[model samples]
Target: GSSGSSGRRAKALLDFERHDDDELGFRKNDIITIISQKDEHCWVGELNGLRGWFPAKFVEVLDERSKEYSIASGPSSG
Candidate 1:
């Protein structure tokens, strides 16, 4: 049983460091690769194994893996 919180719906961005970057910058069908969950405050997840400590707000306790990967609506048209 993984004790994890639900993640926030965000879009992967090409310029995640642009200061004003938002979910609009990310493309649909992007699979965010999770790195680790040892820490409670933050965990790393990014596209194609690219890593970042997405806020705990962006995590979810997968119940036996979901039929849908990103079930929650993302900020993009996707």
Candidate 2:
């Protein structure tokens, strides 16, 4: 059987009010399923059946996939 696409989960530490149509708005403590890392400052995530970009710093990662993805992408310089 094929393992489905596994993503990282994160908990929003603060409310994020979308500034653009492409961004996601979420309340504090919301659980977001991280789909991908857009860049150092942004991440693609899904919450409440909605998906969009959000500030990476707004959420705290809650899984091993966070480290796995980071290391798979590149070495952490810092």
Candidate 3:
């Protein structure tokens, strides 16, 4: 695979600014779709229909979708 998540998801850990054309900015608590794991420090994800790279440390992988909608670490911890 070129780059992308293995069908996982993520959420923003803090506010960030876009520093490059291939990057995306996001606010804290924003939910992002994990598209790819760029590296140990960065990842490619989708938010608001826009896909781009973001810092991996700035986000946390959600666990799973529960009936009560609780976010945690589990299978989707990409």
Candidate 4:
């Protein structure tokens, strides 16, 4: 796990926000890596896989919890 992880952006409520220049419009269904936890309102998430800022309420993180959970299983059964 890296120390400086980031994520995508997504906004809720206003419907027209979809047409904005902000990056994460297409990444609405993807997971966001919170870059800077500025607050609940303005968070730096990813946009189209690029880095940007948006509302935390609208985005989802890959590992919001269980950061320490180890997946020591196998990639192949051989």
- Provide the TM-score for each candidate, comma-separated: 0.35, 0.70, 0.67, 0.42
The number of the candidate with the highest TM-score is 2
Q: TM-score rank, highest first?
A: 2, 3, 4, 1
Best by lDDT: 2
Which 10 successive residues of model 1 have the least lDDT summed? Answer: 17-26
TM-score of 1: 0.35
Question: What are the Cα lDDT values of the candidates?
Answer: 0.44, 0.83, 0.80, 0.51
Q: Model 3 off-target regions past 4 Å? A: 1-6, 65-78
**How displaced is residue 52 in candidate 2, in Å?**
1.0
**Candidate no. 4 TM-score:** 0.42
lDDT of 4 by residue, 1-78 (tens): 467643433444332144445534434355455566677676765444566556666654344344554655677868
Give per-residue CA lDDT, model 2, range 1-78, as digits (tens): 455568788899999999887898799999899888898799998987888998889888886533344345446785
Error of 2 at 1 (Å): 13
Query: Judged by TM-score relative to the true structure, which candidate is superior, 3 or 4?
Result: 3
Collision pairs in model 3: 4-35, 4-36, 5-35, 63-72
Instruction: State in Å the error of residue 64, model 3.
Output: 0.8
